[PDB]
């Protein structure tokens, strides 16, 4: 069983003159991927009671959701990203009822998931991962700006896996060489780096494993990193795939998700399986 901890988000996308509302977030994209791939999945999130109905589709995809109360729901408009509203941060109290083999920390903004909750979770679970977005994307007068993670060298040592994209990796290392940024971030003590970039995934554990995304679509990109991380965690943690095979599996799942907007769909499983997995 896996638990995703993170804010659901009212995503506002202004693309090609059209304003789109998406009820998403890292945890929505990751949890639907793990659940559809047949791993018992739980989400711990915060939003207003009024906004809970906007995220009902999580339960439709088999995800057990703890909708903790918040006076506000997180809302992000996207190019510059603005935190319109922020739900309440997670607390040590929220970790009390943590269940399963794995927990993935998938925050949207620095301060949503306090870094000093990482050593608390470390003691509670066998496989702990986090998404860099929640530690390098910092609200400054609403504007979400990229800032280095000052305490990365203390907390990365507690993580079995750390997810970055190109912009997050460069924020953490000062280089736009994603492979070199993988070497630098692993030297901070994270056992596995999973990096997504234009049309591919790079996984580093001391050795590099690369797989390309073979599909993409106008609005298929958002959540593809969250999807890739969840697919890798299912492959590697739950299905006992080699790091190499989990990387290829992760890329295959992400590719099918990138054919359409929103999270992985049950109808995507046929395309993903390739008459091999399920
Ligand atoms: Mg991401």
The technique by which this structure was obtained is X-ray
Pairing of strands 200-204, 64-69: unpaired
The one-character DSSP state at 275 is T
The strand order across the sheet containing 18-24 reads 18-24, 9-15, 74-77, 82-85, 143-146, 137-140
Place of tokens 């269940």: 99
Distance of CA 135 from the midpoint of ligand 1 (Å): 11
DSSP assignments along 235-265, one per residue: IIIIS---HHHHHHHHHHHHHHHTTSSSS--
DSSP string covering 84-117, please? EE-PPPP-GGGGTT--SSEEEE--SSTTSS-GGG
Q: What angle do CA 208, 180, 252 make, to 5 degrees?
A: 40
Joined together, the tokens standing for residue 205 give 């554990």
Q: Which residues contact 150 (CB under 8 A, 6 or more apart)?
A: none
- Measured between alpha carbons, how far is 147 from 48 in angstroms, rounded to an integer? 28
Q: Is 202 left (phi over 0), alpha (psi -120 to 50) or beta?
A: beta
How many CB atoms are closer than 10 A to CB 167?
15
Sequence ranges of the domains in the chain: 1-278
Sign of CA dihedral 156, 5, 102, 227: negative
Return the DSSP state at 71: S
Pairing of β 82-85 and β 74-77: antiparallel
CB count in 10 Å sphere of residue 158? 18
**Distance between Cα 169 and ligand 1 center (Å):** 11
Q: How many CB atoms lie within 10 A of CB 69?
A: 11
Cα of 156 from ligand 1 centre, angstroms? 17
Q: From the CA of 104, how far away is ligand 1's center (Å)?
A: 13
From ligand 1's centre to the CA of 165, what distance in Å? 6
Resolution, Å (one decimal): 1.6
Distance CA 106, CA 134 (A): 7
| Cα 92 to ligand 1 centre (Å) | 24
218 CB burial (10 A radius; 0-12, 13-18, 19+): exposed
Distance, CA 226 to ligand 1 centroid (Å)?
Answer: 6
Residue recorded with tokens 């993409």: 216
Q: How far is the CA of 16 from the centre of ligand 1 (A)?
A: 22
């Amino acid at each position: 069983m896996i638990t995703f901890i993170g804010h659901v988000s009212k995503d506002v996308n202004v693309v090609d003159g059209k304003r789109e509302i998406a009820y998403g977030g890292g945890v929505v994209m990751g949890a639907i991927t793990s659940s559809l791939l047949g791993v018992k999945t739980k989400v711990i999130t915060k939003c207003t009671r009024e906004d809970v109905s906007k995220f009902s589709f999580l339960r439709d995809n088999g995800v057990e959701v703890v909708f903790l109360k918040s006076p506000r729901t997180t809302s992000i408009e996207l190019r510059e990203l603005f935190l319109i509203s922020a739900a309440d941060p997670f607390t040590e109290s929220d970790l009390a009822f943590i269940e399963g083999e794995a927990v993935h920390i998938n925050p949207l903004w620095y301060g949503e998931f306090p870094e000093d909750l990482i050593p608390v979770l470390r003691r509670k679970v066998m496989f702990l991962s986090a998404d860099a977005q929640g530690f390098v994307r910092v609200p400054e007068n609403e504007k979400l700006v990229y800032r280095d993670w000052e305490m990365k060298e203390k907390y990365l040592k507690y993580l079995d896996l750390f997810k970055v994209d190109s912009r997050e990796a460069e924020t953490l290392t000062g280089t736009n060489d994603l492979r070199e940024s993988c070497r630098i971030i692993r030297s901070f003590g994270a056992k596995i780096i999973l990096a997504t970039h234009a049309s591919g995934v790079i996984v580093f554990d001391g050795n590099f494993y690369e797989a390309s995304f073979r599909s993409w679509s106008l609005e298929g990109r958002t959540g593809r990193g969250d999807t890739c991380t969840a697919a890798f965690l299912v492959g590697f943690v739950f299905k006992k795939m080699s790091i190499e095979k989990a990387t290829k599996f992760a890329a295959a799942v992400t590719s099918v998700k990138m054919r359409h907007p929103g999270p992985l769909r049950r109808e995507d499983l046929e395309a993903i399986s390739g008459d091999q997995y399920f």
